[PDB]
Write a structure and sequence with these properties.
The chain is of the alpha+beta class and about 800 residues long. The chain has four domains: about 1-195 and about 320-380, no CATH class; about 195-320, paz domain; about 380-550, Rossmann fold, CATH 3.40.50; about 550-800, Nucleotidyltransferase, domain 5 (2-Layer Sandwich), CATH 3.30.420. The chain has a ten-stranded mixed β-sheet. Helix 16 (about 605-620) packs across helix 17. The protein starts with 14 loop residues before the first strand and ends in a 6-residue tail after the last helix. It binds a RNA duplex (20 and 21 nucleotides) through strand 13, helix 8, strand 28, helix 13 and strand 29. Its EC number is 3.1.26.n2. Belongs to the argonaute family. Ago subfamily. This is Protein argonaute-2. It is found in: Cytoplasm, P-body; Nucleus.
Length: about 800
RNA sequence: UGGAGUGUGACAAUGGUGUU
RNA sequence: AACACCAUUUCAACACUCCAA
């Protein structure tokens, strides 16, 4: 439970398809770079200030040192060539129109060891080296661009994309230095956001208040305009233009600049009441061109510092946080999240205009970055045959990641004979005609799906308030003998849903299915179809199974599939969910959910959860799992060592305390949807759909993947919009000794066992289910709430989370 | 609350050190 | 009570697109 497994082989299954990744090949020298620690007092200075201080320290001490370093911004310094120092601390003083800086030697970072690491020599890739290189590549844009999080943003070169108000669209990019199979690469992905337009505040008022010009009004119209302008400018930073000095707007004055008064404190004689306009007229010899406009209150309310709008400009680099209107959000998504070729060309254009090969800090260390994206081979895996049943027992073949139930019926359809209707929406907007039409349409779709509605509901009543849920359900449960389903019509977002699911899933164990109000009014066959999928699954039926004869050889012996995900509160306990397959299809899953420490992603009581699932598996199959496939979802790389250490033991421990010396092979895999890796089709004809993304099933385990460890990219879903995010899978452990092809095919095949739709999903079904279970337990003093997530006895043996 | 896909969030929340 | 900074938390929220010929 310490070391991750090496990649066994390279996959050879599927049709090859020429690809390009958003990785840019880097040429890195064998030179050793030198690392030094800085010590700066005071110890609270912002990063930008630190970079500024170091910048001053470099040029003013060229006679002693620096015969061109890079900076972290906080206690990390690198130089290409060495300097006159030692392990001893060298302290000096600098001045900024007053700081004390101490430079201390730390260590040497050899890039020869980096080549030995990228090659087959050293198995471990020095993290300190990756950090150093990343600091080098980020040093310039950290000062040149506007840093946000881990990305860098900037304005537009020619055109200027507006948003209205004081906003406009600034574009940016996220860079990160990553290790590869043979050569270091630079990962880069573009993005966009909304910044405040760098303009005079007098024009900001014009744009916020919908003025063609400021001379449209000679006097302030209303208190509401004051509130609106304040709502937009309160909190923003502005620079002055009659001396430079940056200020922060705390409020907007009620009175015009001609009447806005303040304590003048004219040297001696203390304060005299003076208006802002008279002040700027006397002191700064400036007559206000627009004295009828209010002032910006800046700084402290006790300080009484006001500024006319015509001397203030909004400083650039200020991102917006305010709510975006329809046109703003539209123009945003109408200029970002574009199709795959558009994003591809944007990244290329970015790599062309960023020009890393001409920047001094990059050239200092002799680093060369390829201006073209990295070509990668890639290969499209083969979609599994989906077996439907019914009278004909037809087969569905996933075309482009999507199939349908046209002339097909469920593998195990359920004859629904007893069911109820409880509408919580007002009868005024939801007539009985809507309910009957919805009933007819539902019955037809149901019977067509192989899950026939054998007749009208035994119950149909309107209701209101969540307090009506628990009593009614009890009555419903006691009146009608052997009811199968309770359909709950909701008028939108309401606390009713949470109680419906609480009473339904935990308290009584009744199969409940909520439907939004509008879908009851106007009904399409597709919606009713997916709804039937959910119903048929919730009632214990089987929608569809993988073709039994068309499965990887792992199924030749009893094997269980586990999925795990963790959800954190908005102080409240977090909840971890672990699901497990309960048959050999594998279609049916049982859910286990626990409560945990705040924001602790490491599943603590995992062992017991696995124990339950294992026990339930034996109860449902009469077979003991010779293999355990654990899909962990939600953890990032920085948590791997931690998670893999505990949870794997937690799994293994569960296998020991159960029976004798029963130790099946555990295959610990980490699913990751959140990453800055994009894949594009090289051939224009290979593009799929409007979004023009890579075809569903695209598999990559070369060039852009880890040099030594077992990981692979799999785009298992078809891109509906924008650019697809290929799900990344990292095998942290593997006792079963999977081949690349086998595990990739198994994973892609498990992406077809999703029971809520006739499509291929981005992540495997167990992980998705685990996410649904977790998010469901969200709707449901610590030991008290620990039993709140404990679902019902009869609900446990079902997929209520579906 | 029919479903899937992908954009935004990072002046985010907390515990920590520290400031007139 | 405001304000800085260091280490963590991709959790959740909102929105959009797609499911006529």
């Amino acid at each position: 439970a310490f070391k991750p497994p090496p990649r066994p082989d390279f996959g050879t299954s599927g049709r090859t398809i020429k690809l390009q990744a958003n990785f840019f090949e880097m040429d890195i020298p064998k030179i050793d770079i030198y690392h030094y620690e800085l010590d700066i007092k005071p110890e609270k200075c912002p990063r930008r200030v630190n970079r500024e201080i170091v910048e001053h320290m470099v040029q003013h001490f060229k006679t002693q040192i620096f015969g061109k370093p890079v900076f972290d911004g906080r206690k990390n310094l690198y130089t290409a060539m060495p300097l006159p120092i030692g392990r001893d601390k060298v302290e000096l003083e600098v001045t900024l129109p007053i700081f004390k800086v101490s430079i201390k030697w730390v260590s040497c970072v050899s890039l020869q060891a980096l080549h030995d690491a990228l090659s087959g020599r050293l198995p471990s890739v020095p993290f300190e080296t990756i950090q150093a290189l990343d600091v080098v590549m980020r040093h310039l844009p950290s000062m040149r661009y506007t840093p946000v999080g881990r990305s860098f943003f900037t304005a537009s070169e020619g055109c200027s994309n507006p948003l209205g108000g004081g906003r406009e669209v600034w574009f940016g990019f996220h860079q990160s230095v990553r290790p590869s199979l043979w050569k270091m690469m630079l990962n880069i992905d573009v993005s966009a956001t909304a910044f405040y337009k760098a303009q005079p505040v007098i024009e900001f008022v014009c744009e916020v208040l919908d003025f063609k010009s400021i001379e449209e009004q000679q006097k302030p119209l209303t208190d509401s305009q004051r509130v609106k302008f304040t709502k937009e400018i309160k909190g923003l930073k502005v620079e002055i233009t009659h001396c430079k000095r940056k200020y922060r707007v705390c409020n907007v004055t009620r009175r015009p600049a001609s009447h806005q008064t303040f304590p003048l404190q004219q040297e001696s004689g203390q304060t005299v009441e003076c208006t802002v306009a008279q002040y700027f007229k006397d002191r700064h010899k400036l007559v206000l061109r627009y004295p009828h406009l209010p002032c910006l209150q800046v700084g402290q309310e006790q300080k009484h510092t006001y500024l006319p709008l015509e001397v203030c400009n909004i400083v650039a680099g200020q991102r917006c946080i305010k709510k975006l209107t329809d046109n703003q959000t539209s123009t945003m998504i109408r200029a970002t999240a574009r199709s795959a070729p558009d994003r591809q060309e944007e990244i290329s254009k970015l790599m062309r205009s960023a020009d890393f090969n001409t920047d001094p800090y990059v050239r200092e260390f002799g680093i060369m970055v390829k201006d073209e994206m990295t070509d990668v081979t890639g290969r499209v895996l083969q979609p599994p045959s989906i077996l439907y049943g019914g009278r004909n027992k037809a087969i569905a073949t996933p075309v482009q990641g999507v199939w349908d139930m046209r002339n097909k019926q469920f593998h195990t359809g359920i004859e629904i004979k007893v069911w109820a209707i409880a509408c919580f929406a007002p009868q005024r907007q939801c007539t009985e005609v809507h309910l009957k039409s919805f009933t007819e349409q539902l019955r037809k779709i149901s019977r067509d799906a192989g899950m026939p509605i054998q007749g009208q509901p035994c119950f149909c009543k309107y209701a209101q308030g969540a307090d009506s849920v628990e009593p009614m359900f009890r009555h419903l449960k006691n009146t009608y003998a052997g009811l199968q389903l309770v359909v709950v019509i909701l008028p939108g977002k309401t606390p009713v849903y949470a109680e419906v699911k609480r009473v339904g899933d935990t308290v009584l164990g009744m199969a409940t299915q909520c439907v939004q109000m509008k879908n009851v009014q106007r009904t399409t066959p597709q919606t009713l179809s997916n709804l039937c999928l959910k119903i048929n699954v919730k009632l214990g039926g089987v929608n569809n199974i993988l073709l039994p004869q068309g499965r990887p050889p792992v199924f030749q012996q009893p094997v269980i599939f586990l999925g795990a995900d963790v959800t954190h509160p908005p102080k409240k306990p977090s909840i971890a969910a672990v699901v497990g397959s309960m048959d050999a299809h594998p279609n049916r899953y049982c859910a286990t959910v626990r409560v945990q420490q705040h924001r602790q992603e490491i599943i603590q009581d995992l062992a017991a959860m696995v124990r339950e699932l294992l026990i339930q598996f034996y109860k449902s199959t009469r077979f003991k799992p010779t293999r355990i496939i654990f899909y962990r979802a939600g953890v990032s790389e920085g948590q791997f060592q931690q998670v893999l250490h505990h949870e794997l033991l937690a799994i293994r421990e569960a296998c020991i305390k159960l029976e004798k010396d029963y130790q099946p092979g555990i295959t610990f895999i980490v699913v990751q949807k959140r990453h800055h890796t994009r894949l594009f089709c090289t051939d224009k004809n290979e593009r799929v759909g409007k979004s023009g993304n890579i075809p569903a099933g695209t598999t990559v385990d070369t060039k852009i993947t880890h040099p030594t460890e077992f990981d692979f990219y799999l785009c298992s879903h078809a891109g509906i919009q924008g650019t697809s995010r290929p799900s990344h899978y990292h095998v942290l452990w593997d006792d079963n000794r999977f081949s690349s092809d086998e595990l990739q095919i198994l994973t892609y095949q498990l992406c077809h066992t999703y029971v809520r739709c006739t499509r291929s999903v981005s992540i495997p079904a167990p992980a998705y289910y685990a996410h649904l279970v977790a998010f469901r337990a969200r709707y449901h003093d610590h030991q008290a709430l620990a039993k709140a997530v404990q679902v019902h006895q009869d609900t446990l043996r079902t997929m209520y989370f579906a």
